[PDB]
């Protein structure tokens, strides 16, 4: 057990190991507050997050366990990993606070764009890394579910990492696939490919692609580009009311993407066409995208690793708050730090 030192910031007690110094409140939310600090062990700055009452309810306890299990499993150059996880508690009996530590990479995609105009090269490398980390993630049967520019950290060398996975079950909505946004059916990994598509388009034209004011307004902007649903997709929509509303819409034909992204790399326009397909079963997968001509200068099959098996059977267990809490404690207890470089 390291030596802890406790201090009060923004009216919140932070008790952490002495290795973390000069803690600076970076922000807060209903999830927990986050502090910026310098990690004297790696010599790198980091993000220290203190969870907000991890075990308030069965729901929260389980959600806490899911986040911890997910972060511990993530080991890839393009995905944020768990640098450290700790609790000042000396036993389960007193276990109550959970602290998560991750790398502070530089800036999110939005802050990059706001600073400079990107070259087609940058977009290539950026989208490539996104798909590279996504390939890793999807191979583990994990779906991020909330990809957007704010969840993309980029460093000075244009290197990228995916952060903040969606754990729950305008902005966000603008990069969401339609089957999710309106709960049309059980969705698959390709929802993230839909997000990548929206993000790529924005980087190329400097404009949000589907900035709808509300769900209906967005669905219309979307269906106007890709065309209205066909019978094949319709039969997949489980909601009878949903199907009913779709059929009520005035049919629309898919647009020629070349006519929307004038002046962009023909290869990037092709890739977009492949990602922005309305039927999720027809969208290109992460692995498939890495092999697309647009990324010819960065693609390397021997350097696009998949992940180990990720066991999610826990999602279907019905446990007591304290069982979920003890499970979480066990995970904290068994955490092995990443090799020092």
């Amino acid at each position: 057990r390291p030596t802890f030192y406790r201090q009060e910031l923004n009216k919140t007690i932070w008790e952490v190991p002495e290795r973390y110094q000069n803690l600076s409140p970076v922000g807060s939310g209903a999830y927990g507050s986050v502090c910026a600090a310098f990690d004297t062990k790696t010599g790198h700055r980091v993000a220290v997050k203190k969870l907000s009452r991890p075990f308030q309810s069965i729901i929260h306890a389980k959600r806490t366990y899911r986040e911890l299990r997910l972060l511990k499993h993530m080991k890839h150059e393009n995905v944020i990993g768990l640098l450290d996880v700790f609790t000042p508690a000396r036993s389960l009996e007193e276990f109550n606070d959970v602290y998560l530590v991750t790398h502070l990479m530089g800036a999110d995609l939005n802050n990059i764009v706001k600073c400079q105009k990107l070259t087609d090269d940058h977009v290539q490398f950026l989208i490539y890394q996104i798909l590279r980390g996504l390939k890793y993630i999807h191979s583990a049967d994990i779906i991020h579910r909330d990809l957007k520019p704010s969840n993309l950290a980029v460093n000075e060398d244009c290197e990228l990492k995916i952060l903040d996975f969606g754990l729950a079950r305008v902005a966000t909505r603008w990069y969401r696939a339609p089957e999710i946004m309106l709960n049309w059916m059980h969705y698959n990994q390709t929802v993230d490919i839909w997000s990548v598509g929206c993000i790529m388009a924005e980087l190329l034209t400097g404009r949000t692609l589907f900035p709808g004011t509300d769900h209906i307004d967005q669905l219309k902007l979307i269906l106007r580009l890709v065309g209205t649903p066909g019978a094949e997709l319709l039969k997949k929509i489980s909601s009878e009311s949903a199907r009913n509303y779709i059929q009520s819409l005035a049919q629309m034909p898919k647009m020629n993407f070349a006519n929307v992204f004038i002046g962009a790399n023909p290869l990037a326009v092709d890739l977009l066409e492949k990602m922005l397909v309305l039927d999720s079963d027809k969208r290109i997968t992460a692995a498939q995208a890495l092999a697309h001509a647009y990324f010819a200068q960065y693609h390397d099959p021997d350097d696009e690793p998949v992940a180990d098996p990720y066991d999610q059977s826990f999602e279907s267990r019905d446990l007591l708050i304290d069982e979920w809490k003890s499970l979480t404690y066990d995970e904290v207890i068994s955490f092995v730090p990443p090799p020092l470089d």
Binding site: G106, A107, N111, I112, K114, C115, Q116, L118, D121, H122, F125, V154, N155, E156, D157, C158, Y298
Partner: peptide, 10 residues
């Protein structure tokens, strides 16, 4: 590794 550079805001 790719010879790309980006400016990081303060």
């Amino acid at each position: 590794k790719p010879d790309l550079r980006v400016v990081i805001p303060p």
